[PDB]
Design a binder for this molecule. Structure first.
Ligand SMILES: Nc1ncnc2c1ncn2[C@@H]1O[C@H](COP(=O)(O)O)[C@@H](O)[C@H]1O
Ligand code: SF4
Length: 214
């Protein structure tokens, strides 16, 4: 009742992908803000960040202060990740939303067995990450992700702007064309907060039981 129609969203995603071909991340964020601004938590587009660094958060706040950003609090997070989330909420001009599943960790352990991540990690991710993310994305017309094509060989064709079929709405990846050197230089130039575990030999940060230890 507060999202654009699916054909309208598909046409908007097509036009955005065609017009923003080879554009910078700030240009894509400006286009997203101009297209989904009104009709500062009265915004119609949200940003998703795993709280590994405040690059995308800083960019979105510089293009749109008070922008909302969601963080999927699966309950299995590192204490450093929650600390980084709180620090980003305090420093940057961003409205943070802690998306939590309807069932806590103890409730899920009681209902389907303790340590579901060990027995069915796909179902654990679907219950604590995918379903709450979908329930939160209802009402927004577009979402912004910090996905980079260098994350995996299967992500090499990650589109700049597209229509996410899983959640059925516009998906924008400003950091797609970015490389490791690019994010490094940006981190340097803007003095943006970084999760402390990244310094302690952790390329990617996720849930504590499902993160590869060095
Ligand atoms: N726990 C999370 N909480 C909030 N956003 C996330 C989370 N995980 C991934 N995202 C989104 O997914 C991107 C990275 O995906 P991945 O390659 O699975 O780590 C991030 O830049 C965000 O756009
Ligand atoms: S990363 Fe592991 S603990 Fe976190 S939701 Fe997915 S399966 Fe569960």
């Amino acid at each position: 009742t507060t999202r654009l129609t699916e054909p309208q969203l598909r046409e908007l995603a097509a036009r955005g992908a065609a017009e923003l071909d080879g554009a910078t991340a700030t240009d894509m964020l400006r286009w997203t803000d101009e297209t989904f601004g009104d009709i500062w938590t009265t915004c119609n587009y949200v940003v998703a960040s795993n709280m590994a660094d405040a690059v995308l958060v800083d960019l979105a706040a510089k293009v749109r202060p008070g922008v909302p950003v969601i963080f999927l609090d699966t309950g299995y997070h590192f204490v450093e990740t929650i600390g980084t989330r709180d620090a980003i909420e305090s420093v940057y001009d961003v409205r943070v939303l802690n998306v939590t599943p309807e069932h806590t960790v103890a409730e899920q352990d009681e209902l389907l067995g303790k340590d579901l991540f060990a027995r069915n990690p796909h179902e654990c991710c679907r219950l604590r990450k995918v379903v709450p993310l979908g329930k939160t994305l209802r009402g927004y017309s577009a979402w912004v992700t910090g996905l980079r094509r260098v994350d995996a060989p299967t992500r090499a064709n990650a589109p700049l702007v597209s229509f996410d079929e899983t959640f059925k709405l516009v998906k924008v990846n400003p950091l797609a064309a970015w490389t490791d050197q690019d994010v490094q230089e940006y981190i340097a130039d803007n003095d943006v907060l970084v999760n402390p575990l990244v310094r302690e030999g952790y390329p990617s940060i996720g849930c504590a039981p499902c993160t590869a230890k060095p």
